[PDB]
RNA sequence: UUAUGCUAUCAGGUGGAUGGCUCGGCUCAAGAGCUUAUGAAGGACGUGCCAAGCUGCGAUAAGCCCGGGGUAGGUG
RNA sequence: CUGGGGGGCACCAACCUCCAAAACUAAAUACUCCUUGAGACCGAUAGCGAAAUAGUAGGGUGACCGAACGCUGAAAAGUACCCCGAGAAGGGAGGUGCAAAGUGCCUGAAACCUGAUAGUGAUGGAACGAUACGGCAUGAAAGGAUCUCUGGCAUGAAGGA
RNA sequence: GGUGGCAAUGGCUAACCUUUUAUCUGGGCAGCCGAAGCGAAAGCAACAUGUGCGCAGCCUUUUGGCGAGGCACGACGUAU
């Protein structure tokens, strides 16, 4: 329905009627399913080598030799080729031909996306989910927001709209990860601040890009990860008039 | 509501069903009407065996201006002749259009439980 | 020059470890003093034997002196004044790292030095 | 099976450790043991031995699509709404070869006036169509 | 001061587990794809100031000449 | 050519359809020695047999089989001088370093071995322990203070002299 | 089996294209299952409720009445 529109100076300069996507009921399980399916589809095959631990010609000694019945080397008494022998193969390892992609029907995936979009209207879900804000949900901005081209201007707008403390929270929450993930490329653990939505590709997708936590996307690139990080809806977001225009029958 | 009904409640995932079950038991205690407790025990059954009722069955059995509780979904297959009130858990779009064209209403279980405190003349279908 | 497709620690450490010896000249980089940077337009420079440095980190914060030698493979420089003593007693140079020093006087003798600093 | 349910069970739900050896604890591989020692199971599954009948070539055979008169009658308004049918002088002129149906059966009631053209007609379908005042044309 | 011993804890020896680190491995994707009688791939022998192995090289033997890039050190 | 073939048993007829027994021809595809990128992959008995002086040491007449071995510190500052000793062994004292981390040197478990402390012990019977009561030793932190010990008073179920 | 989306005007797409690097958004009606069965085959082609008993639930004189789903009949399609 109606929501206040705020300019880059922070003053309400209109009252636009929201489309029917924003008016839907919250369904955690559908969002869960959609996010899990997409994260499963990102994955990448792995597994050991084809003949690992088995390139050998070991034979058993049989009985009467006073020892066990495992295969041994032909010119020694060292066991080989079996899963409980040192250097032997592994029983049931991962396989590169295993297919781990998940399926979700288009109707229920769109329904979960609508449910997640309508969740950003509720102040309670956003507030308890982690963020800090002092604005009137939902936040809607005039279409000149796509014209901003320097990060300083975006920071000025965020400060004037009461959404900069979340950006600072994400900046100072960046912290080193624990475990074997540091050595493989995942050195930090990040935080999610704010999502900016624009109708069409503009310089705003390049200006509000370096700001910590902020993810900027166009209306034709919304999925369930962006709106429910970790399968929890209630992500702070900003829209524009063009983005509101794009969502008359977007996911219905 | 022993541990048995608590387990059957814990299996569910959709929040609206859980809220319906709890509020139905509360309202049943409030009005001393076993209708709401019955509907709660029906909604708490396995999800595979819910009710799916076609328009033809309602047309076959009901009469002019009845009130109907369907703990399931009403499907559109058949022809509806006369006005009817069908408060069901969900409607398909064709069913909604047919009931609206006939001149009836399609109100959820919350609306029926709020409007009528006792169900003085409700007919359960399946 | 190794783009953002080198975000893996194994690749970065391979690049820094097995580098061609003409790339190890770039790792001898140190900040310039204010006058040097505002008269050459480069925020930094490379350290070469014969110039005066000001140590900024470690046990010798603030001590100045010339650079007495540079080794490409090791990646360390040697400075006047900064020394360590043997058990029997013999003052020895202590190696440092050029990213812990500041250049205050450049040594212009090559002629190609000015072009080498910038462009 | 649930592997974690059986950490510390040894046999893992099989009884003795002398079960779960190989193919001899199943009676053979595949549908093996047709009628010596699996005959009762063979008859109950639906794998009884025998050959019965013949087949005609698929070049000549056809599988006709069907539609009953009740179905065709009930959804006639939607058919004219989609522009499939036609409503000249009241009676519905509905052609079955544009839908994709090659035969009209007769289960159900007919009350509206229908002028149905198709290839095939059961006798009862024709009787029900013409007892409602309609006409049927053998479409050629 | 009850010897030879038994049980438990502590200090030390031997040993190399656990933890932390890792220029290595493995899998997938995108590219690119022939060479040799103008003597190839592979091998033997030699080649360093002190040089045994590996790597490179061929009696011009960890190497020679020319053009570009690079700039103050180099001698696997 | 007024010819020939085909239309899932052979022949006849109608109808439909094509022109063998000579030749070439890009793109869409397959693969990975190799180059680049990525990873809910392994992390030194794992991952390739090999974190490569690894197809090596070694084993077989031969076809061929085939290992183990990573880590000082920020900086060698890698123990000056003195005494013992046959000593370029090694020990003591004395130094370097935040810290010996003292060279195959990060941390440094158990089995096993040496010493010390507590209990017991040369008249004594065994699955090495569970439960209750005592001796001796300990009981700083993390455990108790109407808590531990000893008694008085009030109510007291089953039972009950 | 437990939980869900859609629902006779049924459900789902496959390869692939849009990939802007493997995600993702939007297309993709070829096809599969359901919708009519019986029969070796040629072939033929059914109840969109006719009757009764009655649980839940509702009404009621607390005894009876209505009674979805359930059960039992009747009628019909085809094969012999
Ligand atoms: Mg292995
Ligand atoms: Mg190994």
Give the C-alpha separation, B72 to B39, whole Å: 11
SS3 C1: coil
- Chain C window 1-40: which residues touch A at a Cβ cutoff of 8 Å? 7-9
Environment class of A32 (CB within 10 Å of its CB; exposed 0-12, middle 13-18, buried 19+): middle
- Sign for the CA dihedral angle at B90, B93, B94, B98 comes to positive
Residue of C25, D67, C54, B15 lying closest to A27 (CA atoms):
B15
Query: In Å, how far are B78, C109, D66, D73 from D70, measured between CA atoms?
Result: 11, 106, 12, 5
Mutate to test the interface with C, among A185, A187, A188, A209 (most CBs of C within 10 A): A185
Question: Alpha helix (H) ranges present in chain B?
Answer: 3-11, 15-31, 34-43, 55-61, 93-102, 109-115
Contact A29 B14 (CB under 8 A): yes
In the numeric block, the tokens 């893996």 are attached to C8
Q: Which chains sit next to A, with 3 or more Cβ pairs under 8 A? A: B, C
Could you say which nucleotides of strand G lie within 7 A of any protein CB atom?
1-9, 11-13, 20, 22-26, 28, 35-36, 40-42, 44-49, 56-59, 67-69
In the numeric block, the tokens 């939902």 are attached to A138
Give the C-alpha separation, A148 to A137, whole Å: 23
Query: In Å, how far are A28, A115, A232, B61 from A32, measured between CA atoms?
Result: 6, 11, 8, 41
Residue of D45, D26, D44, D27 lying closest to D36 (CA atoms):
D27
What is the distance in angstroms between the CA of the first residue and the CA of the last residue of chain C?
16
Structure tokens at C92: 């020895």
Structure tokens at C85: 């003593």
Chains B and A touch (3+ CB pairs under 8 A): yes
Phi/psi of residue A163, nearest 5 degrees: -135, 15
What is the distance in angstroms between the CA of the first residue and the CA of the last residue of chain D?
62
Give the C-alpha separation, A111 to D27, whole Å: 50
Chain-centre distance for alpha carbon A197: 16
Given resolution (angstroms): 2.8
D58 C-beta neighbours (distance < 10 Å), count: 8
The CA-based dihedral angle spanning residues C72, C75, C76, C77, taken in that order and rounded to the nearest 10 degrees: 40
Give the C-alpha separation, C7 to A187, whole Å: 10
Cα within 13 Å of Cα(A99), Cβ side: 3
Residue C5 makes CB contacts below 8 A (sequence gap 6+) with: none
Give the C-alpha separation, A228 to A117, whole Å: 9
Helix/strand/coil (H, E, C) string of chain A? CEEEEECCCCCEEEEEECCHHHCCCCCHHHHHHHHHHHHHHCCCCCCCCCCCCCCCCCEECCCCCCCCCCEECCCCCCECCCCCCCCCCCCCCCCCCCCCCCCCCHHHHHHHHHHHHHHCCCHHHHHHCCCCCCCCCCEEECHHHHHCCCHHHHHHHHHHCCCHHHHHHHHHCCEECCCCCHHHCCCEECCCCCEEEECCCCCHHHHCCCCCCCEEEEHHHCCHHHHCCCCCCCCCEEEEHHHHHHCCCCCC
DSSP-derived secondary structure letter, D74:
H
Please state at what angle helix A106-119 crosses helix A28-41, rounded to 10 degrees: 120
A217 C-beta neighbours (distance < 10 Å), count: 14
Give the C-alpha separation, A182 to A186, whole Å: 5
Cis peptide before A138 (omega within 30 of 0): yes
SS3 D69: helix
Host H or E run for residue D57: none
Contact B14 A27 (CB under 8 A): yes
Give the C-alpha separation, B68 to B55, whole Å: 12
Give the C-alpha separation, A108 to A106, whole Å: 6
SS3 C35: helix
Give the C-alpha separation, B113 to B109, whole Å: 6
Environment class of A116 (CB within 10 Å of its CB; exposed 0-12, middle 13-18, buried 19+): buried
Nearest CA in chain C to A186: C8
Give the C-alpha separation, D108 to D76, whole Å: 14
Residue of A171, A176, A167, A175 lying closest to A131 (CA atoms):
A167
């Amino acid at each position: 329905a109606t929501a206040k529109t705020i300019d880059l100076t922070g003053k309400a300069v209109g009252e636009v009627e929201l489309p029917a996507v924003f008016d839907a009921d919250y369904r955690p399980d559908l969002i869960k399913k959609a996010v899990l399916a997409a994260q499963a589809n990102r994955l990448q095959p792995y597994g050991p080598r084809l003949y690992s631990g088995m390139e050998t010609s070991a034979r058993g000694w049989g009985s009467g030799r006073g020892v066990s019945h495992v295969p041994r080397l032909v010119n020694s008494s060292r066991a080989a080729r079996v899963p409980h022998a040192k250097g032997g193969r592994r029983a049931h390892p991962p396989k590169p031909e295993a297919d781990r992609s998940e399926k979700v029907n288009t109707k229920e995936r769109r329904y979960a996306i609508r449910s997640a979009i309508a969740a950003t209207t509720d102040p309670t879900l956003v507030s308890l989910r982690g963020h800090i804000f002092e604005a009137e949900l939902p936040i809607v901005a005039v279409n000149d927001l796509e014209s901003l081209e320097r990060t300083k201007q975006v920071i000025e707008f965020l400060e004037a709209a009461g959404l900069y403390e979340d950006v600072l929270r994400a900046k100072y929450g960046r912290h080193i990860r624990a475990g074997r993930g540091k050595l493989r490329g995942r050195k930090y653990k990040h935080k999610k601040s704010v999502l900016i939505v624009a109708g069409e590709n503009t310089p705003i997708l390049k200006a509000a890009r370096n700001l910590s936590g902020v993810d900027v996307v166009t209306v034709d690139s919304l999925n369930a990860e962006l709106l429910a990080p970790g399968t929890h809806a209630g992500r702070l977001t900003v829209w524009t008039e063009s983005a509101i225009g794009k969502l008359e029958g977007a996911f219905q | 509501m022993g541990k048995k009904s608590l387990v059957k409640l814990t299996r569910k995932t959709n929040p609206r069903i859980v809220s319906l079950i709890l509020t139905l038991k509360e309202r049943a205690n409030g009005d001393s009407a076993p209708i709401w407790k019955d509907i709660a025990k029906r909604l708490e059954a396995p999800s595979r065996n819910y009710a799916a009722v076609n328009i033809s069955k309602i047309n076959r059995h009901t009469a002019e201006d009845d009130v109907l509780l369907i703990p399931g979904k009403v499907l559109g297959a058949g022809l509806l002749d006369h006005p009817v009130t069908i408060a069901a858990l969900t409607f398909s779009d064709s069913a909604f259009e047919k009931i609206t064209e006939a001149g009836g209403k399609c109100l959820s279980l919350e609306e029926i439980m709020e409007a009528n405190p006792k169900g003085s003349g409700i007919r359960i279908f399946r | 020059m190794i783009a953002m497709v080198s975000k893996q620690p194994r690749k970065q450490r391979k690049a820094r470890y097995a580098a061609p010896l003409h790339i190890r000249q770039k790792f001898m980089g140190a900040r310039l003093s204010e006058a040097l940077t505002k008269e050459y337009g480069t925020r930094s420079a490379a350290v070469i034997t014969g110039d005066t440095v000001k140590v900024m980190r470690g046990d010798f914060k603030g001590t100045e002196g010339k650079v007495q030698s540079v080794s490409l493979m090791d990646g360390t420089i040697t400075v006047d004044g900064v020394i360590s003593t043997k058990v029997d007693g013999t003052e020895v140079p202590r190696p440092l790292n050029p990213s812990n020093v500041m250049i205050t006087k450049l040594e212009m003798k090559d002629g190609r030095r000015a072009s080498s600093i910038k462009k | 099976m649930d592997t974690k349910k059986f950490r510390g069970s040894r046999t893992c739900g099989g009884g003795t450790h002398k079960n779960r050896r190989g193919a001899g604890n199943r009676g053979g591989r595949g549908k093996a043991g047709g009628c010596k020692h699996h005959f009762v199971r063979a008859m109950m599954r639906g794998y009884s031995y025998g050959k019965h009948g013949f087949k005609r070539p698929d070049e000549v055979s056809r599988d006709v699509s069907i539609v009953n008169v009740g179905e065709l009658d009930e959804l006639a308004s939607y058919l004219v709404e989609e522009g499939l049918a036609e409503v000249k002088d009241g009676a519905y002129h509905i052609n079955l070869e544009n839908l994709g149906i090659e035969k009209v059966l007769g289960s159900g009631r007919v009350t509206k006036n229908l002028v149905v053209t198709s290839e095939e007609f059961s006798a009862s379908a024709r009787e029900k169509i013409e007892n409602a005042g309609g006409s049927c044309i053998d479409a050629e």
